[PDB]
Every structure is written in C-alpha cells, then in structure tokens.
Amino acid sequence: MMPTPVILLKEGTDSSQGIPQLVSNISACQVIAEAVRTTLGPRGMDKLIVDGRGKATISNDGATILKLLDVVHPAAKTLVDIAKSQDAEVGDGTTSVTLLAAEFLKQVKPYVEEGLHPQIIIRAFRTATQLAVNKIKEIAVTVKKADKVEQRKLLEKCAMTALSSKLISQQKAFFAKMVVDAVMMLDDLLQLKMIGIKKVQGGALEDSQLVAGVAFKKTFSYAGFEMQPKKYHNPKIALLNVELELKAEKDNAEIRVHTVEDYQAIVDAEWNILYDKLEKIHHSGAKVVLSKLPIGDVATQYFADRDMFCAGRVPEEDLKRTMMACGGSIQTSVNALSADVLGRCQVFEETQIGGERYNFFTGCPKAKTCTFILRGGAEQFMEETERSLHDAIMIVRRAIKNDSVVAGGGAIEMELSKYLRDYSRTIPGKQQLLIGAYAKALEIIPRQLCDNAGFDATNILNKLRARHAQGGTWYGVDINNEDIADNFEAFVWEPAMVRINALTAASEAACLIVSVDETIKNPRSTVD
Amino acid sequence: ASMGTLAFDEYGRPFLIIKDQDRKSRLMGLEALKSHIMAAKAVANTMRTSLGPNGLDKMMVDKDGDVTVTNDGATILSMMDVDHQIAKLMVELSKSQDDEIGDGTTGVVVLAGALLEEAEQLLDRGIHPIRIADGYEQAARVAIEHLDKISDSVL
Amino acid sequence: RPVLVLSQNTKRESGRKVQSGNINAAKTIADIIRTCLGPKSMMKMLLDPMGGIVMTNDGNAILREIQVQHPAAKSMIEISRTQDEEVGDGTTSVIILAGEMLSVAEHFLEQQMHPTVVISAYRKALDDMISTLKKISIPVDISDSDMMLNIINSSITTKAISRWSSLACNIALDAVKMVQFEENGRKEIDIKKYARVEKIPGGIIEDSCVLRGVMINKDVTHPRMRRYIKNPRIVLLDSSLEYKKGESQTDIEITREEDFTRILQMEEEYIQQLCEDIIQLKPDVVITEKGISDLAQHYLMRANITAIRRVRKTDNNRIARACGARIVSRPEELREDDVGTGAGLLEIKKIGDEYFTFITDCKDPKACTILLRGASKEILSEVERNLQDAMQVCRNVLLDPQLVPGGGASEMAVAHALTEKSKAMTGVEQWPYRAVAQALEVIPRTLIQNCGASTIRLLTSLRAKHTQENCETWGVNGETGTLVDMKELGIWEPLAVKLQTYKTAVETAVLLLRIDDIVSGHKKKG
Amino acid sequence: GMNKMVINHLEKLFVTNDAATILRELEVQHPAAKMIVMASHMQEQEVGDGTNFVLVFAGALLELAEELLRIGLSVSEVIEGYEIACRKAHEILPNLVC
Amino acid sequence: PLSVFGDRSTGETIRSQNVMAAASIANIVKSSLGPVGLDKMLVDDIGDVTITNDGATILKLLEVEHPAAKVLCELADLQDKEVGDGTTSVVIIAAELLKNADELVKQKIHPTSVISGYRLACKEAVRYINENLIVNTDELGRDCLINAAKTSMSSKIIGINGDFFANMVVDAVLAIKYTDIRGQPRYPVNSVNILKAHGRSQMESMLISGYALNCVVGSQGMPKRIVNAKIACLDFSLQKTKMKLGVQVVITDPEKLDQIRQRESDITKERIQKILATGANVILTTGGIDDMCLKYFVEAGAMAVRRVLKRDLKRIAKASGATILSTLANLEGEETFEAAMLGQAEEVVQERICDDELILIKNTKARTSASIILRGANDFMCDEMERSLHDALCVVKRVLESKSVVPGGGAVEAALSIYLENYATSMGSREQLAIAEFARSLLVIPNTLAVNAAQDSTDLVAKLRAFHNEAQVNPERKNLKWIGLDLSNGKPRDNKQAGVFEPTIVKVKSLKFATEAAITILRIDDLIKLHP
Amino acid sequence: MICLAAEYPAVKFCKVKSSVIGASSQFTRNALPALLIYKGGELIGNFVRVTDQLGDDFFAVDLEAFLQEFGLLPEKEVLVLTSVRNSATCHSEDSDLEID
Ligand SMILES: Nc1ncnc2c1ncn2[C@@H]1O[C@H](COP(=O)(O)OP(=O)(O)O)[C@@H](O)[C@H]1O
Ligand SMILES: Nc1ncnc2c1ncn2[C@@H]1O[C@H](COP(=O)(O)OP(=O)(O)O)[C@@H](O)[C@H]1O
Ligand SMILES: Nc1ncnc2c1ncn2[C@@H]1O[C@H](COP(=O)(O)OP(=O)(O)O)[C@@H](O)[C@H]1O
Ligand SMILES: [Mg+2]
Ligand SMILES: [Mg+2]
Ligand SMILES: [Mg+2]
Ligand SMILES: [Mg+2]
Ligand SMILES: [Mg+2]
Incomplete structure (x- = not known):
C-alpha cells in the first residue's frame, strides 16, 4: 500500500x-445462535435483557430475544431477519431457524477453509432443501375424515406441543383448550385483532379466563357514574361514535345576537340539542351506551336518571370487538337508532379483577370474537404469557388452514437426516460431502434438546439414528424418560409448515451468507 | 464471567457483533441463578422482620426527604429504591398480592425467599431448575388442596 | 479490558495488496532517479538533515539521502548500496532494471500465475543473460594506456567532471596504477585505504593533480626547523616522545632534599635518551601519530631534524607506503631498514591561510594523494565522487579485462538473444521469461527519453537493427538521439559492472516477489 | 459473481452483485473514478444492464493506455486510435448478431 | 462472592478463547508452508526489516499476549531447537488438534477421554511410522542426502538453486564428521561458520575447505598472506604489563623507576620473542594487542589478529591441531612456549569480499573444517539465506545420524489418517471418536499444501486418501504408501521415486510435541486473570 | 542527535513532544528545547534552554564537546566495518571435536 x-x-x-x-461471518452467526441456544425445548430457559432505560424483558421466544439484541454485524443480522420472517409467516420455530442456519454454516465452514467455491455449497443447499421439503410434504400425517372431534383433538395437541416450552407449560392443557376454543370462535379470516388480550396484575395463572364475548377496563367515569346499575339481564347495547357532551356546535361556528331574548334562545338551543341527542338514544330501547368519543357528566347523570349505563372514550378496537360479539353497528349519528344497529348480549356486568374494574359482555351466542384475561404476579409475567399464547394461537390458526402434522422432538429432522444421507450416498462425491454435511447439521435440534435437558446427547443420538435406520419414522427425544420414544404416539405433534418454513428460511440465510465474499463499511456520518 | 465475549477474530480483523458490546455485561448459567437467589434472599430477609404482631416497622424516606413509617410490605417494597431486576420482581410480586387480596403482602416475599433459598441447595446437588419448579408446582397444588380441605366457614 | 492475541500496535497486511504495494514502491523508487541516467542526466539538490547540501546525479548518493517508510523502498536502497560497494558503477541502471522487472512481474501476478513460477523463469533468464553477456564480451590489453583512458572516459562522460575528461582520466589512471601492490604472492589495489583524495576549495579545477606521494594538513612543531628538505630520510613512529605515567600505580615517597631535582633531571634525561636513539639513524624527518614534547623538539632540533606530530594513523600508513618506511613504536629498536628513503622531496608550503606538508617526489610510491581544487565544497565533493567512480571502473578493468558494448547495445543484444532462446520452451513459464528479457529495453528507452528524442521510433529501429546477425554493438547515441555502432562511438563498460547489475536487479525482483504478508508494529524484544 | 455487503453512510445494508448499485452505495471520491461511475450510471439509465461491462472495459482501456503512454505514444495518438477502434467495433457488431 | 481482584472466565468461554488464540497463531504462519508457500516480511517499528519463511523466527519476533498462543510459540521454538525443521508443520498440527478436540468437547465428550484418545493415537501413529513408512538410506547413497537437502530448501529463498546449494550443504556437513567413543559418528553442525556479505549473485557463494574469520590483521605492515602457516592460538592479551590490584609500586630511590618502567614492557617483549622463536607465522588471540607488540610482529613478517571470538578460536585450534594457551607456564614454574603447540594450515590469506576483507585459513591439517560465505543482494536476503542454510544443515545432520527417512509431500499424514481411522474402531467408545478426530486433524498439512498452490484441495486430498486406502487394503499394492502430492502440477505422485524425503525424527518429534501441547491446553477449563 | 547516534551506538538518543508527556504551560511555552539525560533509572542530565549555551547553529561537534565537558557522553570505542554480519545465534556450541 x-x-x-x-x-x-x-x-x-x-x-x-x-x-x-x-x-468471520460464520463465527458471528455462531455467536448469534448461541444466544438463544438454551431456550429450545421443554427444558428451555428464559433470557432477561435490559435496555438503556433500565426496563427488563424476560422472554423465551427466540425472535423477541434476537430483536432485543442490538446486532450490528452485517452477516449476523441475517439470522435475526430470518427469525422475524419465521415469526411472521408461522409464529413458531423462531429458535429452530437460527439453530439450523448456524449449524449449516458451521458444518460447511471446513470446506470453505479448504478453498471450495461457494457456488457449489449454495447448489448443494438448494438441492438438499428441495429434497427435504418434498420428503416432509410426502411423509406428513393428514386425516381424510374431517371429523370435528378429531380436528379439535389435533388442534389441542398442536397447541400443547407449542406451549410446552414456556413458563405456562404447567397449565398447558388448560391454555391449549382455551386457545382452541377462542380460535374456533373466529369466523372466517382468523383476524388476530378479533382476539382480545387483557393483562391484569394479581392472581394465579389458573384464574385467567376466556370471555365468550368482550371485556374492557372501565374508562374514566364522570360524576354520577356510581349511580348507574352495574348489571343487566338482557341489555340492548348502543354502540356509538358520538361526543355526548355540551360543547360548541362547530370550531368555526360563531353566534351573533343583539337581544337578550335571542341569548336565552341560543342557550336553550344548545341544551335542547344535547337533550335531543340523549332522548333519541334513550327512546331506542338501549340500556348500555358505549361511545368512542367522550361522554360528558351531563350525559352521565342523564343516563343515571334513566337507570342506563354509559361509558365514553372506549378504545376503538374494543368497540369493534363489542360490535363483532353483540352484532350491532357503530353509529356516528343518533338520528336513526333502529333495532338493526343495536347490539344484544345476554348478560352485562361490571366486576372487580385485581384492583381494577372491568365491563363484561357475556352470553353472546353469535360472537365472532374473544377476550383473554390473563393473571400473573408481575408485568413481565403477563407479557410472557401473552407471547406464549400468541405462539399457540398462530399455530392453531395454521393448523386450521391445513391439518397436516409431523411428530416433534426432533423425529422429523432425524428422518430427514437419514433420508438425505441415503440420497447423498448415490451421487458423484463433490456434492455428496456437502449434502452429508447438511444431513448431519439437521441433527442439531435433538442434540440441543438433550443438552438443555442435561442428557448425554451422543448416546441418545446414536439410539435415534439406529432406530430411524432400522425402521421407524416418528422416534424423537423423550425428555421425561431420559430416552427416546415414538413421538407421534406421544402426541408431540407439529404442523408441517413449521418445519417446511424453518428449512426454507435457514437454507436461504445460509446461501446468502455463503455467497457474499467482500464486506465494505462506509464511515458513519454525523456521529453526534 | 462478565463483559460478554471478546474475540477480535482469529484473522486479526475487527469482530463487532452487538452494538457497544464492550460496555455490556453478561451472566451465564448457574452463576446467574445464584446471584438472583442471593438478591431475593436479601430482600426476603429484610422483609421477614415485619411479620406478625411483634413485627417492626420500616422507616422509608423518598428522594425528597418525606418520611413514611409503615409495616405494609407492599408499601415498603414500592417505596424501596432498587436496581437488581429480581428485586423489582419481588416488588411486583408484593404489588400483585396487594392488588388481588390486600393482605399478606409480606408473607409472599418471605415465602418466595425461603423457596429460592431451598432451591439454592437443591441446585448445588445437580438438579435442573425446571425440575425444581415442577416439584414446587406439585407441592403448591397439594398445599392448596389441603388448605381447601381444612378451611372453615363463617357467617 | 481489551484482551487480544497480539499486541494492539501490531498490524498485519496480506493478500495481493501486499504484492501490489511492494511493486509500486519499487517502481516509485526507480522513478526517483529515472532522470539521472545517461550523458544528458540532470543533477539534483539534496538537503542533508544535518544542514549540508549534496548536489549530485549519482544514484547511490541520491537514494542514500532519502528516508523512506515502506520496507520495499528500504530493500531497493540497500540494493543501490550493495551495487555501489561491489563495483562502484551502475547504481541507477540496477535500480531502473529492478523496477522494470518488478513491473513486468506484477503483470503476471495480476493473472493467476503463482510467484514461484515467475521466480523460476527469472532465474533461468538470469543464467541466460550471464551466458550471453560473457559471449558478447571482448578482451582488452591493459598495457595500452589509450584503451584504459577511453574506458575511464566512457565511465565519466555521464558526470559533471566530463568537461575535464582527459585530466580526470589521467588522474584516476595514475592513482590506480601507482597504488597497485603485490606482496607474498598476493595482488591488491586498496583504493579505500591508500589513494587518498584531499580537496582544498579555491583555485581552479585544471590545477588538480595526483601527487607522487602524500600530502597532509600539518605544520612543523617548531618554526626553527627546515620547511624544505631536498632528500629527506623519514622516520615514522606511534609512541609519544614525552614522559608518560606508568601502567601500574607507582607513587613515590620523597624524604631527602635532592630527590625532587633528581626526579625531574631523570625525566629530562629519559627524553634526551629517546631523542638520541632516534638521532642515531641520522634521519631528516620524524613523524609521530602522537605528541612530541618541547624538550624532545629541542633535542631533535639540535640535530637538524624536522618533526611533525599528531598525525592520523591512516595518514601515517599512507606516508609509510609512499616513502617506503616502517612505523616503529620503540625508538631503541629502530633499524636501518625502517628509515624511509625513497621520498625525493619534502616541502611545507602555505595554501590559502593554512599550512600543508608535502612529500611529493617519491620514486616508486605505493600510495598517493589526489589534490582537488575547485569552486567550493559541494563542487569538490561531486568531483571526488566522480573520481571514485573512475577509479572503481579502472580497478574493475584491471581485475577483469573484459568489456561489453554500452549505451543500450548490451541490453538490446541480451534481450534479442533471450527472445530467440524462448522460442523453444512451449511451457507456462516462457511468458515471464520473455517479459523479463524485453524488460532490459528500459535502459535504451531511458537513454532516449533523457536525450529528448522520440522513444518509440528509435527503440523500434534499434530492435530491428538488433534482429540482424552481426549487430550486437549497435546502441543509442545518448547525446544526439541517433543509432550508432559503439565500436565507432567508443562507449564501453566493464563486464563485471554489467554482470553485477543484472544479477542484483534479478535477485532484487526475486526477493521482493517472495513476499505476500507484512506484519509491523511489534517491539524489538532485544 | 459474488454478492457484496455494502454498508453506506446511514448503516443501510446493501448486499448485491449489481455493479450500478454497488457503485452508487460506495463513497467514491477520486474524480476520475467519479467519471467512470457516471458513465456506468448513464449505461444503467439508457439500457438497464451492462454497467459492470462498462466499468471493466473502461478500466482495461485505461490500463492499456497507461502502458502505451509508458512505451512512448502521446495522449492524442492513444485517443485517436481508441476512437478509430471504437468506430470499427461499432461497425463490426451488427454482423455478430446470432 | 469471590472478591478476587481480577477477571474470571469459565467453561466453554475460556476453551473457545484458547482455541481462537491457537487458530490465530496457526493462521499467521499457514501461508508459509510448502514449495508454493511465500515468505513474510516483518517490521520492528524502528525501521528494521526481517524477510523470512521460518515459522520459529516469525513466532519469535512477534509479541504475543495470550497464554495459549505463547504455548504454541515456545512449541515452535522447542521444535526448532530439538530438530531444526517442521516448525510450521508442528504449530499447525497442534492448533488443528486443539480445534478438533474442542469441537469434541463441545459435543459433550469429556476432555479426559479426548486426551486419552489423543495419547493412544499419537503412540499408534509413531509405531506405524516406524514400522511401515520408514525408508533406509543405506541403499540410496549420496542421492538421499541431496534430495533431503533439496526438500528442506524448497519453500525457501534458495529453492530453485537447490541443485547447487544441496551439494554445498552435503559437502559442508560431510567435512565436519567425527566419530566419538562407542563408534557413533556425530555431525557437529553449528561448527560450520556461516558468513554473510552482500555483493555477487547467490551462485557465487563459496564453500571454504578450511575456516573463515570475520577479522583482519591488526597492523597494515604485516603480510596479508602466508603460505605455510604455523598458527599460534592464544587466550590472553599482548599489552604492556600491569601489576594486579594486590601489587603496588612504591619508589623510595629514584634510580629504580626507569628500570621498573622498562620492565613493564620488556616482559611482554620477552613473551612475544618466546612465542616467535618457535617459527610461528600466524598469531590469533582472544584479547587485544597494543601497538608495541603489533610492531614486534610486523618486524618478524608474521600475522597477528586480535579480538578473535572464543568460539572461532576454539574451532580453529581444533581444526589446525593447535592448543589454546591462556598463559605461558609449564609445570616447572617457568615461562615457555613449546613448538608442538602450533597448528598448521596450507595457506592463510586476507581476501577482499565486497570492499571488505576477511581472513581465510585454507586446508588446515590434522582435521578438516568448513565454512560458507553467502553472497546475496542485500542484508535481508543474506539473512534469509542463512536461516534456510541452517535448516538444510540440520536436516542433513538428522538424516546422516539416524539413517531412516520418510516420503514428503503429505504422504505420511494421509497414510496416518487412513490407518488411524481404520484403527479407532478397535479401542474404547469415546476415545474412538478422539482417535478419529486425531486422524482427521492430521490431514491439515496436505490441505494447506494444496491451498497454498491455488489447487483443488478437496479433490487432491480425496485422491491421496483413496491411494493410501488402496495401499493399506491390498497387500500387493504396498508401493502406493509413497504417493504424495506434486504441487507444481496439482496431481498425486510417488514422492519416494520423485525425491522428496524428510527425516523420520521430524515427523515423530512434531507429532509428540503437538500432542503434548494439545493435551496441555485442553486441560484448562477456567482462567483467572489478576489485575496487575 | 542523528550525527551523534552513529558516533556512540551505546547511547539511546530519543525524542518526544512535550504535549504527550503532560508538561506544564510555562514549560511548553518557553522551556521546550531540553536534553533530558537518564542513566541508572535516575536523572544525570539537568539541561534546559540548550540554545542558551548552544545557539541555533550548533553542530554535532559543539554538542559532543559540551556534553563531554561534563563527562556524560560514554567514551568512544574502536570500530571497524564488518562485511555485513557474522553471528546468527548463541546456543550449545557443539564445536569440532576430533575423536578416535
Ligand atoms: N413434549 C415434548 N417432547 C419433546 N420435544 C418437544 C416437546 N415439546 C416441544 N418439543 C420440541 O421443542 C422444539 C421447539 O421448541 P420451542 O422453544 O417451543 O419453539 P422454537 O422452535 O421456537 O424453539 C420442537 O422442535 C419440538 O420438537
Ligand atoms: N555518450 C554516451 N552515449 C550513449 N550512452 C552512454 C554515453 N555515455 C554513457 N552511456 C551509457 O549510460 C550508462 C551509464 O549511465 P550512468 O549515468 O553512469 O548510470 P550509473 O551511474 O548507474 O552507472 C551506461 O550504460 C552507458 O552505456
Ligand atoms: N518437492 C516437494 N513436493 C511436494 N511437497 C513438498 C516438496 N518439498 C517439500 N514439500 C512439503 O512442504 C512442506 C514444507 O515444510 P516447511 O514449511 O519447509 O517446514 P517448516 O515447518 O520447518 O518450515 C513439507 O512438509 C513437505 O512435506
Ligand atoms: Mg415453540
Ligand atoms: Mg396481614
Ligand atoms: Mg555510471
Ligand atoms: Mg447484467
Ligand atoms: Mg521446513
């Protein structure tokens, strides 16, 4: 130079x-992988990350952990990106993608060190991934009966398998039943915004309940609210998008009068406008009034005089969920409050839950929405419970789309490794080494399971390899029994698309990382 | 055992992965559990002297010099200025017990501290902490059933 | 705490970047003095960090005065120094050749050819160039003084002393001839020790001459001694002629009245005894490397003997060789053979405002001094450097009587011979062989460029001429930019100079082509 | 060709093997390199592909022009020869249509 | 809790850190292995430049802070000291062994099992090398020595000139042969004085049939050449006599002072006369000589060399038959110098080498010695030439001492890998995996050789492994054990017929040292670094 | 110093800016040219304002004589021009040994 x-x-x-x-890129990917290595499996461990502000986020989800890590390595960001992609498309397996990608890179590192051209490695990964995806689609178990009981049991088992890695795994059957019921109460699009997640401090996990209806917190009651009855036995709900309070008619409005009679007439006109709105609402037969815009104290007292319930400033998504559950329509005007646009629920009640007041709309028979009310001893407790339930809900939705499952516990990956090794043993030999490396890299997840559980991974892996070779497809790791077992018969089920997307994303990330040969970093401008 | 990791690569080229990785700390494995158990034990031992009719108050002073003589465990832990995350977890546990019930905000902290203290010697003998948590859950279910059994009703 | 495998200051650079950097540094070092080659070279001014000014077009001095950081440049400078020390000429030529070979090597290095193949091709080409250079050489009769003067002229037409060519050639030839020595069956020249160059600013350059003896910047110790002796008998010494302390601790203890006077008289008597021992040989001049006491001066003066003191050991050895004397460190062991007879005149004369001592009529002297008169100190320094080049060329010719055509003829002939030889390789290594063969054309190209004529036309014409049969002596007239036959122009250079230049350039390229990793910043750990 | 992760002055990741994108996302400072970059971008604008060809051909032409200037040719002679050869190549190209 | 003023690293962290340090050291020198290897060029941040290929030199110059990297550095130094060759190979092998052992440990294999497997693999590899891969040099002649020297000098700056350098090295080594008690011919290398001087090309290097001194005559009046030299080796200065500390001169009568002062030099006069009266022509002393004694030698027309190094003087005395004399004192209490104390030589000259002069003692009698004058282009090239020459001399010494050689070019490593992979199935269950990893790690040398040549390493090593497997399976195909690598063409080749050889001691010592270092580093699982 | 370093290879002439050391404002402004001398780990040279006794045109001869006046420069040693080098390393000699 x-x-x-x-x-x-x-x-x-x-x-x-x-x-x-x-x-160096491969080493950085390994470093990223080992940050979420111990979070995998029923013996997984949560990780605590503190940001600059001092707030701590306790999590077991791989995608959340990777997002909270401020990764700046250009090659290492690919693992975080594919974790986010797996979370977005599937919602489960955010750790498996990272482990698989890093293991692929580690397995092909020795051949890179020997001067092998990366295009050959990329071609080998593409071929192996295509073969593995085809094998998964071929051997996945599906039932051509569409039995409702069988479908419910399949969804419950999938939810239990998804949930048996988090702190709510003790009540996994309870939460899986709740999640399956909530998802089946969704109508046709399985929108996530139609499932409410309410987190209330205090109480045990088993105290958490699912409301076959809608529920939300009490919202800044005005004076006179305590005089309204807090229970109804067949109320008609008037969902409104209306500001029910005395106020100026318009922002640009200006009143010009030159007589005290006109002054009194104007004052009475304002009062009569408000009272006309209130009387139009009252005459509709409704007993519960909900408004997205604030409801003033005058309206609150007016409704209290009529033994009606009112609640302004209701969050918009809460109003939408109420509309879906009760079957009304949000009205921006009160001029036509017909029975068509009035919601109906069997029971409305305001009860106290852990030092807070919640409004309950139960008894809806045609509800297409839900509301999870989660209990726990700490804010991070509710947050992690919500994350686990989100994973379970995504799994159940995907299983609703297609009920094609594969056994968990690494059985699918051991079968794939055996198949890929058998295929690689019949090709010239430059690709054979790389495909065999891919097949061996597929063994990372059962080994990680055994390592997290405190097993001896080598003996279990040898037993699994022998069992798969001699005949047997769904033999994985039995964590409780310190041994291997038929995971399909143990109801450790997993949707096929989870492994399909995991393999696809890991292969894409590995190929992208291997392809790059030069890294250029232009200087930071305006460090400040 | 701290400061995360530092490699600088085997080829001598810079090895930067996490932003400000030199100024970040990291605890791994059993050492983190031991530190958390010790902090929670300290909090529980501080609380345990304010239990029962012969309990003694804690005189809490905020950042403005305001003085609050109190026995309520939830109030003491809420006004306490802590930095350890496990201490914040203890404070939130007291707050949750106060919100759900309103009484017993001190017994929960002492019970949790005792549980973690026993978990310390259980871990020292080579038991996976998930096994300890599962055993604690089973014992808690048994104790709750027994409490339901020996409960008595009042008018 | 930043724990690292290597120290923080250690920096490692590797890859093709290292080879490119080395080759670029060598190219730039060549470009430093590319313009200082040929009879039309332009001189350069160097500002010495000690405050002096060096004005020269000699390659070695210019490259020595430059301080560089890239170690490839240091290697090139060491190459220049080695070429200067070994033969005394061809410094710019070897630097330019090394740069050109490294350029044509970088050519192949940019492709997928391993450097070892280039090294092997370069070594094969070096063997072939040595063979061809020996082949196209001609013998020289060293007895013919005209041919020797012509060779020295060809050696000094490229320097500032070229305007006084006959004078410089005669000075160098006479000095080299009379410093030639042979004893115990061993022949030696020893230009470094004897054949001193003494420069005195002032006067005119045409007054410069080589003396048949030695001149020193010394004066008589006492004014009463003779400053002009016809046929002196010179005696040389190392030991001081004064009373000196003994080696061991020798404290005296005086308890009598007359012991102090006796001690002082004994000192005087010892000095007188030494002077009498010197006088017994009846010399005329006594030269001492150390001091001569005033009483010793008196006792020598009473015998009509000129005494000079405090002379450097090198000057005393030169005087011994010139006048045929032997230095004796103990006067009591002085022998007749040690007395230096053979000097034909000794004369102390004043030049400017400072006395000088001449012993300048020796018959058959084996040492000499060269007296340089000039405009100033820098001009005389450049003249001395040119004289050094001339003497080195003369000694090279005397040691090896082979000559090679100059002015680009040798390079073009060797390039054509290697190009023809490369036609029968049919290997992957023939391309570097041919490239390093035609890399020798940089010397005729540089001569043409410095002359000012068109490079491409003249070089193409020269190559076409050399493609013929008996045209090995066709070179470039560096003054007019025309092709001439150097058996007519008369430019010739010693075969040793060309061989050394080619070998050094090729091995410089070889050494710098073996490097692909640079680490720096570590402590010396001494 | 091998993809290159280029991180610009705003820490935006640019992994690609498209020459125009790489040169756009590089903080090129040398004015001659700037002219080459502008030529490549003009090629991208006019046609849509061939930017790497443009840059490689320009680099090779400049290397060989440096060699020619070293051996003795003047700048004007090299420029005239390059223009003549470019015209000849443009004439030849239609006959090469497959 | 510990409250230790320092930093602690435990578990996989410290293991990975040690492996990274070892891998960094290995990667520093991995590019300077094999004939297609290229030299490095260090700068000592004061301007000093060192161009070299020797792994030991590179690792010695570098400043290293990590302890494991230091361990590899002194491993390189020890390999240089005990053998003199294979330094880079042993460093690379040790680092690769450490890396693969750490991978095995990360696979939850206990490190003690890995250590046991490594020990068994090293023992079995040494046994297999000694029983199947050795070639005796008795039936080869001088060709085996020449080929061993050429193989040693490949990858060095003198590789192409091997045809000449190998002959020079073999002649120099055979010139200094001596058979000691019990009749074991020992070859004392480091008795060949290597002299460097820039100037003429490499091929002008001279092998002196005698001894070369880097010193000149003390006075310009002495002759510069003596035909029949009678060397007198002395170990004391020849100056004016000075009394010791316990002796003090006190004068009470002034008449004695002149006699004292005269004797102060007459003592040395008498010593010089006694030495010269025996016919001595060359006088070499470790001490200094003042002007008076220099003139005394000048008048006699004899050599006189001062400040001669002690080792050079000892070598000259042993070669010429002279006896070092630290003093002139017989067993009768007198001061005498017997004529039998004089060495002899056929000529002593002071030749000129690149504007400088040195003394050559040509063809000493009663013993034959040697010295090499290396001519290069500059100081750096001469230093690298000297280092390569020392490597070649050590290789020739090892070959001539133990008459067993093994084929080069990675043939031994491939054969060992195949044999150990086939053999690991018959020992234990986890040390089986350890031995398999040892066998796999042994393949780094041919891989590095192939990579340095920009050839297809995977295919070439696969072909080598196939050849060696066929050799080890078919009893009648046992001539394939010598199939090594030909880096020029990138194809497997019979290295035994080609002429690529190495001393067996090089491979054996490299394996043993690498295994010991890997075991030493693998023991660490916890590091405490106290604050200074 | 450059000229003197060749004369005395034993001495360890070195230079350093006052900014990095941490000199005081007055020392930086009007006490910069100073010849710090250390031997045995303790100060032996107490020289500041060297221009006061040397001027600005002092040569290496002037500085050498001035330092030798105070007896601080190590005495010179006789030296000769080696070819380039002789020694390579020092270890077990294993010299020639003629044995029966
Ligand atoms: N009961 C179980 N027995 C064995 N393995 C299980 C069980 N439940 C889940 N797993 C395994 O855990 C892995 C997924 O772990 P988890 O942390 O829940 O999701 P992620 O894939 O995001 O890490 C799956 O590969 C599955 O095989
Ligand atoms: N009158 C001349 N005409 C043409 N070439 C000449 C003439 N005189 C010398 N040369 C050539 O110039 C070269 C000498 O260049 P010079 O400046 O002495 O370089 P260096 O100092 O390195 O020897 C020789 O090769 C010689 O052949
Ligand atoms: N002619 C050749 N052909 C193939 N391989 C060779 C040849 N000569 C040497 N080698 C191999 O190249 C390697 C070079 O080793 P080297 O780096 O010189 O050892 P050291 O570690 O002492 O420097 C040797 O292991 C040898 O097996
Ligand atoms: Mg999961
Ligand atoms: Mg209480
Ligand atoms: Mg010249
Ligand atoms: Mg394109
Ligand atoms: Mg070697």
Missing part, C-alpha cells in the same frame, strides 16, 4: 474480503 495522494474511497472506509471474512 502507498499513500496515493488522492485516495479512491472516503477516508475511514473499512474493507474485508476473501476466505477470512467469510469465516
């Missing part, structure tokens, strides 16, 4: 190229 008085790129540009930078 020479000074070159006029340098080519901007001063401070950093460049790395060749085999060393690719090995």
